[PDB]
Design a protein around this motif. Structure first.
Motif, PDB file in Angstrom:
ATOM      1  N   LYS A  93       0.775  -1.105   0.098  1.00 22.06           N
ATOM      2  CA  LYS A  93      -0.121  -0.007   0.109  1.00 22.06           C
ATOM      3  C   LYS A  93       0.881   1.380   0.156  1.00 22.06           C
ATOM      4  O   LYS A  93       1.950   1.214   0.825  1.00 22.06           O
ATOM      5  N   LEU A  94       0.443   2.134  -0.887  1.00 16.86           N
ATOM      6  CA  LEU A  94       1.168   3.550  -0.907  1.00 16.86           C
ATOM      7  C   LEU A  94       0.096   4.621  -0.319  1.00 16.86           C
ATOM      8  O   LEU A  94      -0.904   4.588  -1.119  1.00 16.86           O
ATOM      9  N   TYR A  95       0.263   5.478   0.654  1.00 18.19           N
ATOM     10  CA  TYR A  95      -0.642   6.454   1.068  1.00 18.19           C
ATOM     11  C   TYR A  95      -0.201   7.660   0.465  1.00 18.19           C
ATOM     12  O   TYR A  95       0.920   8.269   0.958  1.00 18.19           O
ATOM     13  N   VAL A  96      -1.209   8.306  -0.451  1.00 12.16           N
ATOM     14  CA  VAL A  96      -0.580   9.595  -1.165  1.00 12.16           C
ATOM     15  C   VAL A  96      -1.463  10.858  -0.472  1.00 12.16           C
ATOM     16  O   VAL A  96      -2.693  10.601  -0.187  1.00 12.16           O
ATOM     17  N   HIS A  97      -0.923  11.801  -0.210  1.00 10.62           N
ATOM     18  CA  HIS A  97      -1.255  13.130   0.231  1.00 10.62           C
ATOM     19  C   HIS A  97      -1.010  14.324  -0.501  1.00 10.62           C
ATOM     20  O   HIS A  97       0.191  14.536  -1.007  1.00 10.62           O
ATOM     21  N   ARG A  98      -1.805  15.064  -0.847  1.00 14.80           N
ATOM     22  CA  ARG A  98      -1.534  16.453  -1.605  1.00 14.80           C
ATOM     23  C   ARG A  98      -2.475  17.510  -1.426  1.00 14.80           C
ATOM     24  O   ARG A  98      -3.686  17.141  -0.838  1.00 14.80           O
ATOM     25  N   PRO A  99      -2.139  18.828  -1.455  1.00 17.85           N
ATOM     26  CA  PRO A  99      -3.029  19.580  -1.340  1.00 17.85           C
ATOM     27  C   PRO A  99      -3.978  19.736  -2.515  1.00 17.85           C
ATOM     28  O   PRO A  99      -3.711  19.649  -3.586  1.00 17.85           O
ATOM     29  N   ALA A 100      -5.237  19.829  -2.172  1.00 15.41           N
ATOM     30  CA  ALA A 100      -6.615  19.457  -2.894  1.00 15.41           C
ATOM     31  C   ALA A 100      -6.416  20.715  -4.054  1.00 15.41           C
ATOM     32  O   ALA A 100      -6.711  20.138  -5.287  1.00 15.41           O
ATOM     33  N   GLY A 101      -6.010  21.862  -3.665  1.00  8.39           N
ATOM     34  CA  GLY A 101      -6.073  22.937  -4.770  1.00  8.39           C
ATOM     35  C   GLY A 101      -4.935  23.008  -5.748  1.00  8.39           C
ATOM     36  O   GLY A 101      -4.931  23.727  -6.511  1.00  8.39           O
ATOM     37  N   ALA A 102      -3.846  21.959  -5.613  1.00  8.83           N
ATOM     38  CA  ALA A 102      -2.622  22.389  -6.067  1.00  8.83           C
ATOM     39  C   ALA A 102      -2.883  22.046  -7.763  1.00  8.83           C
ATOM     40  O   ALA A 102      -3.181  21.225  -8.228  1.00  8.83           O
ATOM     41  N   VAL A 103      -2.047  22.997  -8.550  1.00 11.46           N
ATOM     42  CA  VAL A 103      -2.199  23.032  -9.933  1.00 11.46           C
ATOM     43  C   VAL A 103      -1.345  22.364 -10.629  1.00 11.46           C
ATOM     44  O   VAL A 103      -1.668  21.642 -11.378  1.00 11.46           O
ATOM     45  N   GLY A 104      -0.014  22.502 -10.360  1.00  8.73           N
ATOM     46  CA  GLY A 104       1.155  21.794 -10.900  1.00  8.73           C
ATOM     47  C   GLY A 104       1.924  20.930 -10.228  1.00  8.73           C
ATOM     48  O   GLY A 104       1.653  20.645  -9.194  1.00  8.73           O
ATOM     49  N   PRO A 105       3.146  20.578 -10.679  1.00  8.54           N
ATOM     50  CA  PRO A 105       4.114  19.941 -10.041  1.00  8.54           C
ATOM     51  C   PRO A 105       4.498  20.323  -8.843  1.00  8.54           C
ATOM     52  O   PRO A 105       4.657  21.549  -8.748  1.00  8.54           O
ATOM     53  N   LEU A 106       4.578  19.682  -7.957  1.00  3.74           N
ATOM     54  CA  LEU A 106       5.167  20.009  -6.335  1.00  3.74           C
ATOM     55  C   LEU A 106       6.409  19.020  -6.102  1.00  3.74           C
ATOM     56  O   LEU A 106       6.170  17.767  -6.520  1.00  3.74           O
ATOM     57  N   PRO A 107       7.300  19.327  -5.425  1.00  5.30           N
ATOM     58  CA  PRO A 107       8.338  18.537  -4.733  1.00  5.30           C
ATOM     59  C   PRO A 107       7.507  17.282  -3.951  1.00  5.30           C
ATOM     60  O   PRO A 107       6.476  17.308  -3.390  1.00  5.30           O
ATOM     61  N   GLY A 127       2.804  21.990   0.354  1.00  2.92           N
ATOM     62  CA  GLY A 127       2.976  22.172  -0.980  1.00  2.92           C
ATOM     63  C   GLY A 127       3.835  21.112  -1.213  1.00  2.92           C
ATOM     64  O   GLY A 127       4.874  21.456  -2.101  1.00  2.92           O
ATOM     65  N   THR A 128       3.703  20.114  -1.018  1.00  2.00           N
ATOM     66  CA  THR A 128       4.197  18.749  -1.607  1.00  2.00           C
ATOM     67  C   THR A 128       3.363  17.496  -1.692  1.00  2.00           C
ATOM     68  O   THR A 128       2.212  17.475  -1.289  1.00  2.00           O
ATOM     69  N   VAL A 129       3.923  16.793  -2.302  1.00  2.44           N
ATOM     70  CA  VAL A 129       3.034  15.276  -2.808  1.00  2.44           C
ATOM     71  C   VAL A 129       3.972  14.319  -1.819  1.00  2.44           C
ATOM     72  O   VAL A 129       5.050  14.129  -2.249  1.00  2.44           O
TER      73      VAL A 129
END
Ligand code: MG
Lengths: 363, 357
Positions: free
Chosen positions: A94-108, A139-141
């Motif tokens: 399993k991989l648990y992915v977290h990101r800011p919901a509003g984020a437009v483009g690539p993030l670190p 502001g990361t993935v």
């Protein structure tokens, strides 16, 4: 006199003037304001009893972490998803992915490896969910890997099972950077996840896989394997192991965890099991590293030693110390010491944002 | 297998695969791509002869620095002024002030202490003017102190003259933060200015003057005083002193400079002269520190040692290494290695912007 248990053998976090007092009071409900109770067994106990002990220790630490995370206001605006991939040995990861919901483009990107001595705890547990939401919020993935443990509910799978799972999961995230909205990719983790983070980079160099790693951030790394050595041996080589023994974690518990992780300890001096042993040639050519150590952590000295090794090997390395902090305090006390927690999250954000994508640089 | 001159005693910056090759070619015009020539005297020579040698060494390093700074476009938009203050001992001390033109509002301040082993070089020289302009351009107010040197044109004034001048100048800047447009105040410097930076903080704590110091940034600090020990002693304690001896600077030169600074070496174990000797009690309670060290610098190990000491005393400490860098390469090779130079300028900017009063 000398600090901690070097100057007064009976000193504990509560009686050590160096400890952040907020964290003493946060640990008091669990009895961990005072020196941890000793282990009822050692590394010579039969494996069956070692696994029972590790299962109980897992539950006990999870109870502490659940209580420390309980009642926190949610981190606003985080999108979570679970991916399931094929491991190296027919196992699902399993991989648990977290990101800011509003984020437009690539993030670190941050490939996060949880701690627990490579033998206990789940990435699905509340302290890790919280840390990955907190990192994503900046502001990361963040991708948290659920690898096979040496013991507990996700074990027992000896070394190198968890390290192999981390390798396959890192390769999967690296192959999907664009799909996952990732620019650069950093491997990060604390304690036993700091071990697996550092070993993941050593192994990636050996295997021609370093394109996957733009940076490495190791917190309070658990990397010497030397917890079962005598008090005199530990004082001569890594004095923090005596000075702060029993401050949240103890050498006796860790010595049982060493044996649980690798039965027979054929890999006691193998840098992939215990990165403290890395030779200069293991570290030359590695990507930028941060080693973060904690002031009143028994593991402080082995983390400082690894920073010296990276410096001696020409790595673009940095180090920091967290004042007043027991082992992993900067990841535990989001309630009682929010400034300490924020300073670590912000240091990681500042590191990953500084990185260049190395696959596109001549190497 | 061992790096540098531990593995091959004849290795030099040019033949060390670790060196940034752009810095090798930049040092070739001066013959400093190869190991520095040995010192013609030792620390036992008469004081008169040691001062003659230091004066020639000053002129020779100034010539290198001037040539490395020649042909650069100036840093744009910097306003410069010189202040002259009363020193501790009837002496005037110049302060070189740099700020960005048309900054609005207070900015982080940097009290900059130049290097030269506490015995040579001037803050008025082009390598320091450039570095202070570069720091100012990031959004800081930089004050370069021109203190009394142990030797050269601004000497001879043995320890603790320079340290006393730094203390009085820091007090003067602190008392005038408002007038100077400074918010926080950081003490910073490289090499022998890294020594004086670290000693200035230890002295401020002793003297109840720590309100003057919100942070400390020491680059490639020159702090052990152990350059005159045998090759075997240096190898055992601070192996970089052997591994990279002669890479730009040499232990023989440094051992003469120790004696020049503090003749008779009564202060050889005094943390105010040689901060490597600081006790835990000297460092407890100090403000945030950065220790920056350079990969192929003989002074690397003493700077790493000081980071360990600060960690063990509970200071909010950080450290970094500059890969491929000889001693002070990150302040010298603005032309040939601009990425290396900018990374150090930006790390200092990041540090001082992170601080609070
Ligand atoms: Mg005289």
């Amino acid at each position: 006199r000398r600090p901690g248990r070097l100057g007064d053998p009976d000193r504990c976090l509560r009686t050590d003037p160096r400890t952040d007092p907020r964290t003493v009071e946060a640990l008091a409900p669990f009895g961990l304001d005072v020196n941890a109770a000793p282990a009822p067994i050692g590394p010579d106990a039969p494996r069956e009893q070692q696994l029972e002990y590790a299962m109980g220790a897992e539950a006990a630490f999870e109870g502490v972490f659940a209580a420390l995370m309980d009642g926190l206001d949610p981190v606003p605006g985080i999108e979570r998803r679970t991916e399931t991939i094929s491991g190296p040995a027919g196992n699902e990861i399993k991989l648990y992915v977290h990101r800011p919901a509003g984020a437009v483009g690539p993030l670190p990107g941050i490939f996060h490896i949880h701690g627990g001595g490579m033998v206990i705890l789940q990435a699905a547990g509340p302290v890790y969910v919280r840390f990955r939401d907190e990192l994503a919020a900046t502001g990361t993935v963040v991708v948290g890997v659920e690898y096979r443990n040496g013991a507990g509910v996700l074990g027992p799978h000896p070394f190198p099972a968890g390290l192999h799972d981390c390798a396959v999961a890192l390769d999967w995230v690296h192959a999907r950077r664009a799909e996952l909205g990732i620019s650069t990719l950093t491997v990060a983790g604390e304690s036993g996840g700091g071990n697996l983070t550092l070993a993941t980079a050593i192994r990636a160099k050996r295997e021609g896989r370093l394109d996957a790693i733009d940076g490495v951030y190791a917190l309070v790394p658990y990397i010497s394997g030397m917890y079962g050595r005598s008090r005199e041996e530990r004082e001569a080589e890594l004095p923090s192991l005596v000075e702060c023994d029993g401050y949240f974690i103890s050498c006796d518990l860790c010595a049982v965890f060493v044996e649980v992780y690798d039965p027979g300890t054929a890999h006691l001096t193998d840098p992939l099991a215990w990165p403290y042993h890395a030779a200069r040639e293991d570290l030359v050519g590695l990507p930028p590293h941060v080693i973060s150590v904690n002031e009143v952590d028994p593991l402080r000295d082995e983390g400082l030693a690894y920073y010296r090794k990276l410096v001696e090997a020409g790595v673009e390395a940095r180090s920091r110390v967290v004042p007043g902090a027991c082992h992993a305090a900067d990841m535990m006390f989001r309630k009682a010491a929010p400034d300490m927690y924020e300073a670590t999250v912000q240091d990681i954000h500042d590191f990953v944002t500084s990185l260049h994508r190395l696959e596109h640089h001549h190497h």
